[model samples]
Target: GLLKESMRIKMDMEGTVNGHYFKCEGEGDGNPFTGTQSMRIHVTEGAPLPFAFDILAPCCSRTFIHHTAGIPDFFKQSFPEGFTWERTTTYEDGGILTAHQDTSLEGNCLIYKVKVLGTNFPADGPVMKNKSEGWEPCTEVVYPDNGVLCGRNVMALKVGDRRLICHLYSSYKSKKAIRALTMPGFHFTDIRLQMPRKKKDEYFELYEASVARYSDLPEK
Candidate 1:
């Protein structure tokens, strides 16, 4: 079946963050001083229910801190009492690349290398580390095959104290965890975020403000 109508899904985040001031840390910008950047999801297509959420790689995104100095010391800190990531990030402009593709089915099946730029830090979340608790299908990236008969999928998430909602697709055929990566269509659609328990409409309001601010950004 093909996509029907256009709808928007979003992730709204709201909560008090206390602890460290940064997520990834390092003494001065590594790989040479370039610039700062922010991430954004691009909707390449509104039809066929297809889109791309690309976090341009090799990019530099600065962090906003409640405190200063020693900020790069706790780069290895984990969640629950670690750094707080605000929706707004401030830093020098660096480089930018793309991750999380929405390409053809045949385009997948290759081990695409993506660079997590800035600082090399540890992943403490559902990233595959231990084969003990078993391989959790909670954070794997997925894509279609050569035929394009099947859909593509990344993986489901289970962030602590947060809903395990797949911000993108929301339909199922076989009701299988594998279905999470199934490409319901050739294109991606319904781009959104999983809000973090923010008050109703609060996320939208904040988003509007952010968009407005960005709208005022100087032309590059």
Candidate 2:
């Protein structure tokens, strides 16, 4: 879960850099203590050829070495006139991390390698304390009259004016799919039983078939 959160933040920040010319993907080797073990970033042709290296030493006591190689010739040529950039990351829990980006043409490949040392810092630190879970389940749902079948919740609606039959689906565990289907310019109307069953069961969750239509444009 922390990996997801970290990647989300990383991608969000990447989207703002150089008019969103950079993209990144991360891979983990199943080491819980080190968090993200490896990551690769792609730079588009026009953006500034950036380089970074960091030491993310934590308070947990395990050391991590992130980068393992030197910069390539193509990248070095792009940054012929380059200089070293460095920064320090100080944590609220009394932990300090350092990073440097001063690499020569011969060692340019090392820029891709990210090495972090030490164990994970405690979560109880003042600013790093655990907070609320990042995502929440839908709290309420309004399934149509013909929305249940065989003790299962199902919805069939038309998106916009398209004649294609769109099946409503949801990831909620408690039959909250209706909540996910709600959207602007969408109107759920014409509730009816589908097929020859010719009956509606509003009380029981079981039913033979049901039908509904959703219109995006106001009725003419």
Candidate 3:
């Protein structure tokens, strides 16, 4: 089935999700100067599930690294390494959008490195590409014909037994690799500017701190 689209009533304005704040700054097609487009997720653990959603999208490109904590064992079982899924779907704008998911893991935390592309309406039928071996493509109809969907390319992740949604936006430079975008319902919180892109050890320490703080809070 398709994801339930979050409706829009007003012209696009800055907003927050799950008590986390977000701001869209600048515009253009990934110019890295005045044209660089960027979105930030302020790092925090959600109230009920207490999972940490961390975002790292550089101001230079469309490469979005979404680091999520608390990966259920069942979800981790799906990706065995070097797994990728690709499909083409018709968008409301009347063009075909091609999207893919590249799944892997960092320790117990599941990683979904996704990429989405938009084409000017293809002549052939909807296509699915398999970039890796030993796995079949996910046949679930997770996309929508209209309204809001997560990511330019979206990744469906399980927290407990249900799927947690996330979003991604695109740039004109790459035009193919869309960055991680955030929506309201997902447990993802605010995006901050003061957070530093430090060494791995330093980053994990922060992540661990988040886990410790929220681990006992309880899930929704």
Candidate 4:
């Protein structure tokens, strides 16, 4: 709880939601393309949520927030939309960890959706792109559906010395050229989706319980 502490040590907020390990960062993580980002994870109905402790986010800010005067106020902004709880645990490097819950499901999958409000979005639509006369998975980006133009880590559901995660979404949309680059991190940008990759020199995909990692953050 560092409302009165230094903000320089933005502990990396890493997370393992629904069993998938996600390491988010911003231009702060390491990448170009203005750092836009995105993510999608699925958790079983009764799985005991897991946590990954690393030199992860702007970690623990959520816990620190609760410890501050915003304790009651934080809960107000937190639990309203749902999928929230007072889950926190302090760990290595000197930070805390918080768990999260989601209530959104797609078809036969239990998917969770989170969002971070921002005013720095380009007044356009999503940038993930769609094929011509064809269909793409990123319809939200192609059609100004959700109007999501966000980076990464800015809305962490986890952050700390042990484990943390942030689940967020957007609705402003942007016409910015979304390159397949840009890492996710604090105040980050762009999204790197996880799915099956075939037809390339390699065939890969985000397996069930798949874990992904990027550049440095939590390793002080």
**Top TM-score prediction, candidate number:** 3
Best by lDDT: 3
TM-score of each: 0.17, 0.20, 0.24, 0.19
Q: Tell me the tens digit of each residue's lDDT in model 4 across 1-220.
A: 2122221111122354323344432211111112122222222221222222111211211211211211122211222221232233332223333443232212222223222111221122111111111111111111112323232232222222222222323222222223421222223222223333322211212211111123236667
What is candidate 3's CA lDDT for residue 46? 23
Question: What is each predicted model's overall lDDT from 0 to 1?
Answer: 0.19, 0.22, 0.25, 0.23
Residue pair clashes in candidate 3: 20-190, 40-191, 41-190, 41-191, 42-190, 42-191, 151-167, 151-168, 167-181, 168-181
Please estimate how well model 3 matches the true structure, expressed as its whole-model Cα lDDT: 0.25
Q: Give the Cα-based TM-score of candidate 3 against the true structure.
A: 0.24
Per-residue lDDT of candidate 3, residues 84-182 (tens digit): 344454433233444454434343332333433444422231211111111111111122222232224333323344443333342111112122222
Span of 10 residues, lowest total lDDT, candidate 4: 127-136
- Candidate 2 regions with alpha-carbon error over 4 angstroms: 1-78, 103-113, 117-120, 123-220
lDDT of 3 at 181: 21
Give the alpha carbon lDDT tens digit for every residue of 1-220 in model 1. Answer: 1111211222111111111111111111111011111222221222111101111111111111111222221111211121222112111122121122111111111111122222111233222111111111322122234312222333233334432222222211221133233232232211122221212211111110000011224568
The better candidate by lDDT, 1 or 4, is: 4
lDDT of 4 at 44: 22
- Candidate 2 weakest ten by summed lDDT: 54-63
